[PDB]
Amino acid sequence: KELNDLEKKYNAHIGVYALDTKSGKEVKFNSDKRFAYASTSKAINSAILLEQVPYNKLNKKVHINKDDIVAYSPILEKYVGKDITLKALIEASMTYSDNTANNKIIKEIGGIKKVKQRLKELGDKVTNPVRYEIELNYYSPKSKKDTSTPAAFGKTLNKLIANGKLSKENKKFLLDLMLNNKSGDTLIKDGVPKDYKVADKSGQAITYASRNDVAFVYPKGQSEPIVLVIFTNKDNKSDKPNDKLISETAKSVMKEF
Numbered sequence: 001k002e003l004n005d006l007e008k009k010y011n012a013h014i015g016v017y018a019l020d021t022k023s024g025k026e027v028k029f030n031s032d033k034r035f036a037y038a039s040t041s042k043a044i045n046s047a048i049l050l051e052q053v054p055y056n057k058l059n060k061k062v063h064i065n066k067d068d069i070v071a072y073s074p075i076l077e078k079y080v081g082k083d084i085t086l087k088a089l090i091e092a093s094m095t096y097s098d099n100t101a102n103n104k105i106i107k108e109i110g111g112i113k114k115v116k117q118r119l120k121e122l123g124d125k126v127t128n129p130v131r132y133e134i135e136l137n138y139y140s141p142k143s144k145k146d147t148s149t150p151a152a153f154g155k156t157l158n159k160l161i162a163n164g165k166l167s168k169e170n171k172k173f174l175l176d177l178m179l180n181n182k183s184g185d186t187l188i189k190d191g192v193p194k195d196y197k198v199a200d201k202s203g204q205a206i207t208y209a210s211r212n213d214v215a216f217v218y219p220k221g222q223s224e225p226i227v228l229v230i231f232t233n234k235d236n237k238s239d240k241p242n243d244k245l246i247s248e249t250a251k252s253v254m255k256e257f
């Protein structure tokens with residue numbers, strides 16, 4: 001189905017960027033529009049830490065205190081005044097979408113400053129990390145704070161994971177979390193054919209029914225993933241997202257590959 005027609009049908013704005021890393025073939029829809037990325041950056045944050053810490057060192061520990069906790073920290077909440085390994089941080093962040101794990105991660109990398117630095121080095125001058133969790137979820141169509149374009153975000157994932165500097169194991173560790181993650185089930189995982197493997201990281205901003213899904217999609221018989229970035233929003237601040245919109249956009253995009 002047409003992407004515009006999906007916009008119409010679901011009464012929403014869609015931004016799509018798809019790269020078959022095999023062919024170099026891109027699918028684009030509103031790919032230069034800014035959208036709040038939300039928890040989808042947990043993926044980006046996670047990869048960056050992993051370029052600086054070999055798999056064998058994930059056993060390293062970080063001390064968590066009451067000052068570390070932010071809302072929606074289903075895992076980290078139990079670690080107050082405790083230590084956690086880098087490995088468990090990442091798993092908390094990617095699997096349960098733990099906000100505190102994401103924040104400690106950004107810290108480990110060295111701050112937003114360092115994330116931002118790293119992005120420019122990948123040639124990403126678009127992705128705009130400004131706040132920590134959970135504030136970064138406070139989206140305004142009038143602020144560029146914590147937003148990116150489907151195209152810049154999509155090129156970043158590609159340079160970071162798909163064709164990056166990650167070790168084999170790290171790469172696999174991250175990707176295994178994206179595959180197993182059960183939170184993205186209604187998203188991209190629900191729109192592609194039965195055959196494909198879907199490594200996703202979903203997101204949801206607080207405002208304007210900001211519902212996202214990024215993935216490394218593996219068509220049966222293909223070992224190279226299609227990078228798929230789906231950013232969505234609505235016109236009203238208080239609008240509720242419909243997951244079906246993404247499943248359906250995913251399905252439409254799959255057709256081109």
Ligand SMILES: *P(=O)(O)CNC(=O)OCc1ccccc1
Nearest residue numbers: 038039072097137203204205206
């Ligand atoms: P990620 O899952 O996208 C981080 N988002 C988050 O922690 O909260 C956003 C939120 C809170 C309440 C309702 C809708 C979205």
